[PDB]
Amino acid sequence: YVNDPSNYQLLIKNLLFSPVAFNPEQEIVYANHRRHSYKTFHDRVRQFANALTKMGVKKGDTVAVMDYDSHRYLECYFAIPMIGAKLHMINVRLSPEQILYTIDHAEDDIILIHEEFLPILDQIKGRIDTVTRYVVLRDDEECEYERLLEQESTEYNFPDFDENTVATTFYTTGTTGFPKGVFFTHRQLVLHTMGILSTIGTNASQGRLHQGDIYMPITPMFHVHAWGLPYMATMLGVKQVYPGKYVPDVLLNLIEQEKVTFSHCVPTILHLLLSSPKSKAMDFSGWKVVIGGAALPKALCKSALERDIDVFAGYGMSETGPILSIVQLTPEQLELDVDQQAEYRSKTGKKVALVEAYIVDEDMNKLPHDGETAGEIVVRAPWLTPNYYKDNKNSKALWRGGYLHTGDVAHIDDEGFIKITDRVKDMIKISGEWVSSLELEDILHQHQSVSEVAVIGMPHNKWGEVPLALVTLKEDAQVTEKELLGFAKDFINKGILAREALLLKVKIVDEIAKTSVGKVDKKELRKLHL
Amino acid sequence: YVNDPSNYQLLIKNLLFSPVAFNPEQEIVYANHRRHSYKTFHDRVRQFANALTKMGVKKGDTVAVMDYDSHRYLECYFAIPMIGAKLHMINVRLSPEQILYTIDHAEDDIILIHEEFLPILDQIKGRIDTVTRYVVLRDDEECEYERLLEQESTEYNFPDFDENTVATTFYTTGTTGFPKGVFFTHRQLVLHTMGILSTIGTNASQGRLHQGDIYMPITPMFHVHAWGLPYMATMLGVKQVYPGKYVPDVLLNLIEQEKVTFSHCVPTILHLLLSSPKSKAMDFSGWKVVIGGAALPKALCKSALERDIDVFAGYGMSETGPILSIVQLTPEQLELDVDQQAEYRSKTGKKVALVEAYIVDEDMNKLPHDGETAGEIVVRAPWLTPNYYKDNKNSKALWRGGYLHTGDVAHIDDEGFIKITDRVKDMIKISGEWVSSLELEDILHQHQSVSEVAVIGMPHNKWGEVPLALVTLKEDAQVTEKELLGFAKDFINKGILAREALLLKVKIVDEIAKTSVGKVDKKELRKLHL
Amino acid sequence: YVNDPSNYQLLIKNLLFSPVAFNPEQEIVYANHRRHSYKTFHDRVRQFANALTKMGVKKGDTVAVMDYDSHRYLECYFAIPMIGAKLHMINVRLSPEQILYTIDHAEDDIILIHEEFLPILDQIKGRIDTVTRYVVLRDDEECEYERLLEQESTEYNFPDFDENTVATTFYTTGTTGFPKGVFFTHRQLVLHTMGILSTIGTNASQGRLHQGDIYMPITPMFHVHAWGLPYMATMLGVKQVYPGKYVPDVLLNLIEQEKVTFSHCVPTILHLLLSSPKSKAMDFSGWKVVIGGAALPKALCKSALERDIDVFAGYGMSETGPILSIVQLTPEQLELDVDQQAEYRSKTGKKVALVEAYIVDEDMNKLPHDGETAGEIVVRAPWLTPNYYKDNKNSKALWRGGYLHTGDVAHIDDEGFIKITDRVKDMIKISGEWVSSLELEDILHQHQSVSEVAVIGMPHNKWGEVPLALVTLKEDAQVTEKELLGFAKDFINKGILAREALLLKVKIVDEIAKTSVGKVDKKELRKLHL
Ligand SMILES: CCCCCCCCCC(=O)OP(=O)(O)OC[C@H]1O[C@@H](n2cnc3c(N)ncnc32)[C@H](O)[C@@H]1O
Ligand SMILES: CCCCCCCCCC(=O)OP(=O)(O)OC[C@H]1O[C@@H](n2cnc3c(N)ncnc32)[C@H](O)[C@@H]1O
Ligand SMILES: [C][C][C][C][C][C][C][C][C]/C([O])=O/P([O])(=O)O[C][C]1O[C](N2[C]=NC3=C2N=[C]N=C3[N])[C]([O])[C]1[O]
Ligand SMILES: [Mg+2]
Ligand SMILES: [Mg+2]
Ligand SMILES: [Mg+2]
């Protein structure tokens, strides 16, 4: 590489060795297994770089990781990109066939796999044929990664290369039939860290990530760089606690004993943490959690606020860095009551620094920013994937019209708060009046004996589409279609006709098909009804 | 320009239209003359862009500004770069000959000059011959800039171009004989804003610039983008107060009545503000000021702290963005007494995010980071000027060894605090024991009747250099050389011989030569002694 | 495209419109469904080109075909490449998951699928998301392809483009875990036709494909361009008979009534044809069949020769055009008895024109051409795939050492006859004496009650590998391990020890795992034993 010293390159090694703050005695904690200082963390990063160089990993190679949230994962976030290699984060929650597909598609040279994921590997090990070495990670002294690090020196000269070198890659499930690989460069990750650290932390009092915080991720580190927050916490030089495999009791004990103040997780994990018996006696006053990946229920947000938790929502996807918007409350909004604060904190959020967010129709006409007009979110940001890896048509559809298409339908109010209604694929085309399936699912989710609602929508001769609803019920507490229709009626707002009782046609279904991740697979549900 | 939508360009228009926060009703205040909202600010930026397009200003053209800190200056920080033109900030405090040299060297097409600077223009107007139009700025309704803006619409489509397009340029005096022009691109300014906003604001409690702050610059806006802070305040959407021509009473009244919480100025301006009679009855508890451009005296810092001012130091130069290091205090350091806090806050500061700072010798050997070992600061950062404009040899000397040479001699302690001792050109070469002139000047500055000290140093046969000192005295309170030598003796530490009484050879001088900026011109002083 | 008229491009349109011979009244026969002349064939090719242009198919697009051997398939061999599009031949015998993987990987825009394959499509239709239109092919008047052709004119101006434009693509199963896509350009297909037509046809009397022949493929047209023979037959302007879905009675009736003289099929199809009851009364004197895809048994060749069939073997793979070698007999060899002629005709064959064939070791040392020294066949030819589509490491392994690695172990005698022993992956590493698994399988296949033999080989402490054998037996005619060992003993030649009775360790297995194609999947068999 022709390195011009005056031509600065935005590299992850600048995130590590030129941080906002660096305390060499600040601790990196891996649950109850390991503790070491930031100086030891840098030494281990250099040792891992030396080991990767010894293992034959060159610039441009792909190193795959199948591990829980640990210090090893963080050492992989830095070391693997910082030597010019591509870090492939494998979603361990995918099916073994999907994991095999991602491994073959990315063509990983080295796989760092935790010993608990060995049963997954054994199902697909014979069909990989592209990985030259497997390193088995363990939470004890017999870890192969630790032994590899021990043989290496703590000195390494990390190279200078183009900031557009691909640093991380991972595959999102979506609805494409096969996982789609998105990739991010060193420049994109550095800009993501800078922009979000300029967005949060510069807030007045609420929702700050600052140098005095103690960081504990509860979002898997294979899930879009764990929302890019491990890089941010390292850049701030804060104390980082890594819980490993998620157990609610272990998570709560780590929060209590390590004085964790900043965390991030999906709403289900927050619900599990708040519903745990031992969380009742815990002090949550100093704990801040940001909820992303799914819509934060207002009831869950209110319950968290009643525990003095600074809970606020965020939004992003695998293609977008991920962070696109974070809920930031003005001091006037912080003076509101608990219900209004829960309403504001459950929003999709205001767009973060350097992000252009618009809601558009099918023709990309940039719908007006009212609190009721819903359209597809299209974004421009410094940390968007340019395309899907080794894909053309899906890549073209992703960036149609010069904007990245999120596939999410939302309305943005006058003050800039986004509120996601549902997905684009879930739109119910009742003539010209498109309605969201999620609002009807939420309406039906308040029934006396309802368990799960999944509104599909199937073609209709007159209205084009009518919202067919699937409802699962409590055991032995059977509810008929007519009772559900009566309950759904008389609610606020409706489509085209009265309260849509003639179109809802609810059907009781034994089970709802779900993807490997856990979201409802409406594509499979359409097979059973149309 | 071939604009690839997925290839994001770091542009100032993204700073303006994609901020961290944007309150359309937030006010931009120009002292007691004008107030308007952020929406009006954006409308005026677009109107100014339209006017510049009408005036024939194309991409690559240079527009010069000779104005005080005003809303017009901010509208120039955005509009002029955001249309692809180069913003030339003219140092109005330079001599008219130097200003003429800078205007001719930069080849400005349009000059926006305040009516108070017209006497300066009239001395050099006949020798410019390169400016096609002069726009006279006034603080009333007869301002030509306001009339030009009034004729234009509030709609403009700002172009997309390479992020490496030069956005701002200005000339530093230095010691080169002629002013040297440094320039910064859109990418460099955006990265400066992002990095410093990640550095300050993410601090725990002390020295924060956050979205709830009220911003008032007391650093001239032609001085290295006013330290880049107007961009940062606009990016945060905070209330901005612009004082115009600096008057201590006006500044204090603006601080009191506009509830200013964040400011920045040179130490002399802070001393003037604290020494003003009306500052005694003012409440300074909520006011944060960062002191740059010169070393902050410990006594001044202590006096500011005794007024409950969150005062801390920063460091930079025209070539470096400018911000390279800012004093950030850990919570342990905030618990110290007033004297220790003043000692820590008066440091040069810890290097800011994405900045590599090293102290090196004449051979660039990266001296160890002890609290006593002094060397020249060499820096790498995303916001450094690549060279001097239309210069080769000085540009080569600036980036010698692959690092930007600051010309400042400093020691960096173990925890990362930089402490500038003096300039490289001011080094006294007493054999192998180089000593700083500023420490001797400070020692002699505590005399009973001393007024100003300027240690030069002239060649010596035995020791190579010996610290010749020039001392100015109080009127009619004459002090001889021997008395000054006796006072300077018996102080802590010395060079090569006892207390350097045989080498100091103090001489009483009527006046000390100073540059147009106001700093001591030791080059002229050398003419009178060697 | 910058078409220089003097710079001739080797295009398939030159194969069609500049043939060796062109009789406009020569017939193209699709079994008992359709008959039309060569003039009608050209008109239908131009109509199909017009329809594809109307359907939005541009140069570089991929059109997939799921059809039996028909006139429609041939019209696809010409029309789709001749307009600059890529013809994707889908192996309809693969599993639906593999077919879906190939469709997604190739990113087909249009799929021409026979109505009999609609059940396969319905299993994977929801997960394709990349195909814009499906054309359903039928053997009657309601065929969508025929209706599309009827709407178009018979005039088309086929473009001139680079001869290196990719014309055809298809996916081979192999042992890579996922199907690997190979592709061939217009130049490669034209050169394949020219070279093989120079190889066969220029033979003196035996094994000729000449202008007086009548052609009927019994090799699927998705299997490596049906061995490139449809192009050759079209280039010769011979009468072509296409049987559609393979039925032995239909095939024999077509051979008898259409006077078919040249055919090609796998050995299993030839065995089925010869074992059919109605083949006994048929006259096979004028019928020539070339057997490829698998080793031709000597017994089957002798049985075919006893029916006066000019049967000879050929060799190739999906990566190599496919044709690499064809059995061509000298007039002296044609005078030999039936047994010697069967021995010669069952060979892998002599390398065809413009093909470099070598047998090499693991270090690529070009083993000598003796009739006993076995090594891996590595080839250079004008019609080899340069790499696997969207693959790097498998592509690198394919062309390791500057030669295409066939993966087949063979010995080449002094006169140039190749004889494949087994695959490279099937090599038994008994110390330095590697032995072929297929020879042991053939030895054990002569047992009194044996049905299927699959020698795997599992690691051994002393000899590295020992030939573990799996044997399936006739129903209720159980045979023990010791009896099989006794039968296998006393045969000609052996490895390292006596007759390898101490290492064979035969095990009786209920069933042998097989791939979707039908070959033995020794990778799955290794899972059950090591
Ligand atoms: C938020 C933090 C703001 C602090 C940045 C201040 C930048 C000031 C740039 C400036 O004055 O530039 P010039 O080229 O005119 O002068 C550069 C020289 O000024 C001296 N300097 C600057 N800051 C200093 C501190 N904090 N202490 C001691 N000396 C300082 C240096 O000689 C520099 O080379
Ligand atoms: C006019 C002459 C026509 C003969 C060409 C036949 C080409 C068949 C291509 C094929 O079957 O390809 P695949 O990738 O599916 O399989 C390739 C592997 O098949 C085995 N093979 C092919 N021909 C063989 C003969 N004649 N004898 C023994 N084995 C054969 C090889 O393992 C090959 O790698
Ligand atoms: C700090 C801040 C943080 C936040 C961020 C988060 C991110 C996440 C990502 C994910 O999850 O991804 P994927 O897997 O691809 O997915 C995507 C999707 O999801 C959803 N979401 C998200 N987020 C949210 C949602 N919803 C609602 N709400 C919210 N917040 C959508 O659909 C997308 O697309
Ligand atoms: Mg996604
Ligand atoms: Mg300077
Ligand atoms: Mg093959």
Residue numbers in the entry:
A (entry chain C), B (entry chain D), C (entry chain B): 4 to 533
Sentences from the study reporting this entry:
The acyl-ACP synthetase (termed AasS) of the zoonotic pathogen Vibrio harveyi recycles exogenous fatty acid (eFA), bypassing the requirement of type II fatty acid synthesis (FAS II), a druggable pathway. Very recently, the AasS (533 aa) of V. harveyi was found to feature a large domain at N-terminus (termed AasS_N) that is connected with a compact C-terminal domain by a flexible linker. As expected, a hexamer ring-like overall structure was invariantly formed in all the three types of AasS particles, regardless of a cofactor/inhibitor. Obviously, the pattern of AasS oligomerization is recognized as a trimer of dimers, which mainly relies on two interfaces constituted by the AasS_N domain.
We solved two high-resolution cryo-EM structures of AasS liganded with C10-AMS inhibitor (2.33 Å) and C10-AMP intermediate (2.19 Å) in addition to its apo form (2.53 Å). The decanoic acid (C10) as a favorable substrate, can be converted into C10-AMP by AasS enzyme. The occupancy of C10-AMP intermediate renders the AasS_C domain (colored hot-pink) in an ‘open’ orientation. As for the cavity for C10-AMP occupancy, a C10-AMP molecule contacts several AasS_C active site. In brief, an adenine base is held in place by the hydrophobic side chains of Y318 and I423, and the ribose hydroxyl groups form a hydrogen bond network with the two residues (D411 and R426). The K522 residue from the AasS_C domain interacts with the ribose ring oxygen atom and the bridging oxygen atom of AMP via two hydrogen bonds. The AMP phosphate is coordinated by a Mg2+ atom as well as the hydroxyl groups of S321. The carbonyl group of C10-AMP gives a hydrogen bond with H226 site. The hydrophobic carbon chain of C10 is fixed in place by the four residues (V293, I326, I329, and the conserved W230). Notably, the W230 residue plays a gatekeeper role in eFA loading by AasS, which is equivalent to the W234 of ttFACS.
